[PDB]
Write a protein that binds this ligand. Structure first.
Ligand SMILES: [Cl-]
Ligand SMILES: [Cl-]
Ligand SMILES: [Cl-]
Lengths: 593, 594
C-alpha cells in the first residue's frame, strides 16, 4: 500500500487536469488541434476543441503569446458531451482525439501507458513537500533544484513514461524521488571492454580517485578469489535496474563465462539527474557524474548508451573544451563544459554479430564519467539546472522570477546576463564554427551569484554536438561529428531548440506572472544578438546569410514525432527523416535587426 | 548481488550449452531445418555433420534415429570445428551461424538469443539444485517435488524457458523450478469493470470465504470501509505479484488511482508456481483451489496473460465437459476426470478496451481463475504426478517412467497399457464420439499413481484449450465458442501431433535408449490399446475408417518453426490455423497395425 499511496482520486484528478491543459496547449502549438473561438463568456478569451467524432467538447480559456504559444488556463478546462459535464480524463482525451492527433491503432495503447505513467509521476510529485520558487531559489541547493523540477520537457506531453520501471523501481530510481542510488560495479574482460581516457586521465589513477584505493582493492580481491587476474579486467559501473533486469538475463552468457563479474555496490550515494541514468555523486559532490546504460523507454528513445560511441567520447569533449578555451568571444561569455572525461564500452560480440549498428542490443552496457561543476564554483556561487528557469511552483510562480527578485536587477538586466552566458555562445558556435549543441534545460547548468547568471556550463556533448559542414577539418577521432544539413535548416538549431522549445516558455511564464513583457524579453534577445554580431564584424557575411532576424522560420513539431512512433521516434539510420515541419512561426526577432 | 548469479558459472554454462545444442541439433533435424550428413566410420554409420550457413563451421555428433524421425543426438559426442580446430560449444554462436538455415530473421534473431540465454540460465539454476535420481523422485510420492523437479520443459521447443520480463531476482522468486513460496496480492475491483463467474455449485460470498477465511474477507471489507468504499461495489481478484508491481501499478495506474482497484495486501497462503508459471498450487492447503493469474511475461511464443473476456464462459465450459465425461461409458471406464475451472474473475480496463481490438494483450492483463485441486480426490496409497514426469530424465539419464515401471513390478508393456487406457483412450474416444480435442501435453495432465501404476488421468487447462471440431455442433450457448472449423484432413493431427509426435516420440525413445522396452513393443502397445478401444465401439466404425489412426503417414507439424517465425505472437489469435507449419510427413508407427 505504501508504494501506491500517491495514487489517490484527488491527486489523479489534478494530474489529469494538468496534463490535459498541456495537451491542449501543445498540440495546438503543433497545429494538430485548432481551437475554435467561442463568442464572449467573461469578456471573451474562450475556445473549444471537439473530439474526432464531434460529440465531446473541451472548452477552456487561453492567452495566445508569441511563437503561437497557447497559455491554456488549467482551471478553465471543462469537458462536455450531451449538454452534460464530464470529468477531465487524459486517457479519454487521447482516445477521443486519436485520429486528430494522428495516433495509430498500433501506437495508441502504448502511448496511453506512457500517459498513465506520466500522470502517476505527477501524483508522486504532488505528494512531495510543496516548495515555493522563492524557497528553492533561496536554498542554494543544486540537487534540491535538480530533484525538485516537476514539469520535465516543456513540449512533450508524454514526457515522464519511464516504461520498464515497476512502481517499486520508480520509487527507487526516478529523479523526482531524490532516492539515493548505489551503483553496481562489474569487472569486464578486456577482450570485450575498452576504456577510453581524455587528456590527463589514466585508468589506474582514475578508478582509484573515483572509488578509492580501498574499494579498488576489495574489487581486485573479488577477482582473485575466483581465480581471475585483475589485469584482464576493466571496471564498469551500471545502473542497478540495468543489472538486475537486463545484464543478468540478456547478458547471462557474459556473467556465466566470467566475461562480466559482479563486484558489488560502490559505497557512494548517487542521485539520478533529470536524464534519469546520469548520476550525481551526493556523497562526494566533486567526484564525476556517472552516465549509465538504462534500457527503459522515455520520450521516444531507450536510455541505452552506445559502447561504440564511447571510444570517441573523451576526445570530442577535449576538442570542444580546447576550442572554447581558445575563442575570445566564448571566453568573454564565461562558457565552459563539464567534460566527459573517461568512458568504458562493452562489446557483446554475439549480439554484435546478430544485429546492425543501430540496435539497442549494442547499447546495453557502457558508461561515461563527466566532471562535476561543483569544484569550479566559488563561495558565493550556486548551481541550478537551466530547466529551472521554466519551472513554476505549485502557485504558478516562476523560478526565473524568483531569481530575478533575489538579484535586485531589473528583469531585462537579469535576462541580459543569462543571455550572454547561455545564448551568445550558441550564436557564436554556430556562426564561427558551424557548431551546435542540444542546449535545452537539462543540458545546461547555470552558475548563479545572488540570483544572477554568472556563467553557463554545457553538458551532454559527445552524443549531441554537430559541426554543420561535411568538409570540416577535424581531428580524426572527432570527425564523426561533421554532418550535412541543408543550409535552410541550419538555423533551426537556434530557432527550434532555443526559441520555440525554451524561450517560448520562459518568456510566457515571465509575462503571465507580470514580471516582464514578451516585448521586452524579445527586445533583450534582439539587443544581445545585435551586440554579439556587431562585436564580430568578420562574420558579417554569414550573419546576413543566416538571418537571425528573418521574418519567419519553420515550426518544428516535437509531440508529432512521438505520436508517430513512441518507441524509436527517430530512425538513427536516417535521423533528419523524422523532422516534422508544419508551416512557419513569426520570428519574434523580426524587425529587430 | 553475488548470490543471485551464483548459478552462472563457466562449468554450469558449458554443460547448459552442450545440453541445448544437443537438443537443437535433434529437434531442428526432426523439423527438417537441418539435414545432417552421415560421415564414414564410428558406429554403423552413426556419426553426422551439420555445417553453418557459410559452411565453415561443422557440428559433428553421434545419434540413434528412432521412430517419428526422432534424432537421439548424444550430448557427449557433440563437437564444433572450424579451420581444422575445435571450438567450444556455444548455443549463441550456433544460432548465429545457422541463422539463414533456421529461418531466423534479422528482427527475431536478437530476441530469440535472449530467450536462449534465459533458457540456458535456467539450466544453470537447475544444475545447482540437489540432483535427485528418477528413482528417489518416484519413491517420494511428493506431487510438488515432482512438479518443481522437472528440468526439461517442453520437449520439442528449444527456447522453451525464456520467461522474458523476469529480472534475475524475479526469476529466483517466481520460476517454478525454484520451488519458491509465493504469496498472491489481493485486489478489490470495482463491479463496473470486474465480473465474477461461477460454476455450478459456486456462489461468490461463500467461495471467497472458503478460500480466504472469513477473518481475511472481513478484514478486506474493513480496508474498503476505511477508505469510505462499500464492499458491495467490489469483487476480489488475486494477482501474481510480478503483475502487480510491474504492470498493474503502472499500466493500470488510473485504475488504482480512481479506486477501481484497491490493493488489499498479500494473502497468507503460500503457493508454488506450477510448470505453467502463472498457475499456483496452494502449498499451505493443498486441497484449496489452484489460482491461475494474468502474467505479462513472454514464454514459448506467447505472453502469459489471461483474457478477461473469456472468463465469462470459462466455468460453464468446464461444467459442460465434466458432465459429458461423467455421462460417457467409455470415458467412465478409463477413469478420466478433469480438475474444473470453477470460478473466474475478469477485469475490463474500459479505456484500454476502447483503444485496442479484442486480441490485444492489453485486455489480458487482469483476470484470474480458480481450478479445483486433485488432492482431495485421491485415496490412501495414491500419489500425484504431472504427466510431464513420464518424459523426464534425471542427471544420469534415467527415465522417471522407467522408475515407475520398476516400482510397479509390471512388465513395461503392462505398465504402458494402464497409462494408455487412462490417458490416451479418452483422447481417442473424445475425438471419435464428440469431435472433442484438448491440449493433452505433459503439463495439462496429472497422473494418479498407485504402486507405480497409472490408475487414472486428470486433465486440466480446459476452457482455453478444448475444441469441438464441428462448426455446426449443437452446444449450450455459453459453450458454443469452442466449436471450430478444421479441415477434415487436419483433424486427426490433434492426436498424431500432440500425442504421438510431441509426447510419445520422447517417451518411447527414452524407454528404448535405457534398455527398458523396445520402440516396437511400445508402439505395439499403443496399437493394441487403439484396436481394443475401436473394437469396443463398433457404432463408430465408419468414423474410425474415415479418420484412420493406422494410416501409413501423417503430416509433420513443426513446433520450433512457429517460434522461429514469430517468437512474440507465435500464433495470430485472429487466425489460429494460419500459424500451422506442416512440412512433409512422418511414417506413422501405427502403420500396418490396424
Ligand atoms: Cl541530466
Ligand atoms: Cl546526459
Ligand atoms: Cl501447470
Amino acid at each position: 500500500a505504501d508504494a501506491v499511496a500517491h495514487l489517490t482520486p484527488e491527486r489523479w484528478e489534478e494530474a489529469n487536469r494538468l496534463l490535459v491543459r498541456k495537451a491542449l496547449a501543445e498540440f495546438t502549438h503543433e497545429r494538430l488541434l485548432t481551437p475554435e473561438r467561442e463568442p464572449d463568456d467573461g469578456g471573451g478569451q474562450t475556445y473549444v476543441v471537439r473530439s474526432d467524432d464531434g460529440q465531446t467538447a473541451y472548452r477552456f480559456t487561453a492567452t495566445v503569446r508569441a511563437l503561437d504559444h497557447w497559455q491554456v488556463d488549467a482551471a478553465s478546462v471543462t469537458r462536455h458531451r450531451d449538454g452534460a459535464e464530464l470529468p477531465l480524463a487524459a486517457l479519454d482525451f487521447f482516445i477521443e482525439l486519436k485520429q486528430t492527433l494522428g495516433l495509430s491503432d498500433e501506437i495508441l495503447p502504448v502511448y496511453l501507458e506512457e500517459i498513465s505513467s506520466t500522470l502517476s509521476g505527477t501524483c508522486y510529485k504532488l505528494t512531495k513537500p510543496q516548495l515555493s520558487s522563492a524557497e528553492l531559489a533561496r536554498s542554494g541547493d543544486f540537487q534540491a533544484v535538480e530533484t525538485g523540477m516537476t514539469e520535465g520537457h516543456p513540449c512533450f506531453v508524454a514526457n515522464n513514461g519511464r516504461l520498464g520501471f515497476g512502481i517499486h523501481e520508480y520509487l527507487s530510481y526516478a529523479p523526482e524521488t531524490a532516492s539515493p542510488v548505489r551503483l553496481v560495479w562489474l569487472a569486464a574482460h578486456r577482450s570485450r571492454a575498452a576504456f577510453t581516457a581524455g587528456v590527463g586521465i589514466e585508468y589506474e589513477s582514475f578508478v582509484r580517485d573515483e572509488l578509492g584505493a580501498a574499494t579498488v582493492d576489495r574489487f581486485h580481491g573479488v577477482l582473485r578469489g575466483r581465480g581471475l587476474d585483475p589485469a584482464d579486467y576493466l571496471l564498469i559501473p551500471v545502473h542497478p535496474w540495468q543489472w538486475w533486469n537486463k545484464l543478468t538475463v540478456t547478458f547471462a552468457a557474459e556473467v556465466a563465462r566470467g566475461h562480466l563479474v559482479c563486484l558489488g555496490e560502490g559505497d557512494d550515494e548517487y542521485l539520478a539527474q533529470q536524464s534519469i541514468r546520469t548520476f550525481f555523486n551526493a556523497s562526494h559532490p566533486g567526484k564525476h557524474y556517472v552516465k549509465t546504460a538504462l534500457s527503459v523507454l522515455n520520450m521516444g528513445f531507450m536510455q541505452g548508451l552506445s559502447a561504440a560511441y564511447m571510444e570517441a567520447t573523451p576526445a570530442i569533449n577535449d576538442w570542444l573544451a580546447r576550442l572554447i578555451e581558445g575563442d575570445p568571444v566564448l571566453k568573454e561569455t564565461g562558457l565552459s563544459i563539464i567534460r566527459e572525461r573517461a568512458a568504458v564500452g562493452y562489446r557483446h560480440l554475439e549480439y554484435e554479430q546478430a544485429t546492425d549498428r543501430y540496435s539497442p542490443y549494442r547499447k546495453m552496457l557502457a558508461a561515461l564519467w563527466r566532471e562535476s561543476p561543483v569544484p569550479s564554483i566559488r563561495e558565493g556561487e550556486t548551481l541550478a539546472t537551466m530547466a529551472s528557469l521554466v519551472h513554476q511552483d505549485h502557485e504558478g510562480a516562476s523560478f526565473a522570477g524568483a531569481l530575478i527578485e533575489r538579484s535586485g536587477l531589473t528583469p531585462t538586466e537579469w535576462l541580459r546576463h543569462y543571455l550572454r552566458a547561455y545564448y551568445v555562445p550558441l550564436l557564436h558556435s554556430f556562426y564561427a564554427y558551424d557548431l551546435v549543441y542540444m542546449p535545452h534545460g537539462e543540458n545546461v547548468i547555470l552558475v548563479l551569484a545572488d540570483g544572477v547568471v554568472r556563467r553557463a556550463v554545457y553538458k551532454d556533448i559527445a552524443e549531441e554536438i554537430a559541426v554543420m559542414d561535411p568538409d570540416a577539418v577535424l581531428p580524426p577521432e572527432v570527425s564523426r561529428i561533421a554532418v550535412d544539413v541543408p543550409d535552410d535548416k541550419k538555423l533551426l538549431s537556434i530557432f527550434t531548440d532555443v526559441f520555440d522549445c525554451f524561450f517560448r516558455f520562459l518568456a510566457a511564464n515571465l509575462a503571465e506572472e507580470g514580471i516582464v513583457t514578451e516585448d521586452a524579453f524579445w527586445r533583450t534577445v534582439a539587443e544581445v544578438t545585435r551586440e554579439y554580431q556587431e562585436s564580430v564584424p568578420e562574420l558579417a557575411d554569414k550573419f546576413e546569410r543566416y538571418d537571425m532576424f528573418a521574418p519567419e522560420f519553420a515550426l518544428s513539431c516535437l509531440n508529432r514525432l512521438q505520436l508517430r512512433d513512441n518507441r524509436q521516434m527517430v530512425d538513427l539510420a536516417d535521423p533528419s527523416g523524422a523532422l516534422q515541419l508544419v508551416g512557419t512561426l513569426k520570428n519574434p526577432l523580426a524587425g529587430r535587426g
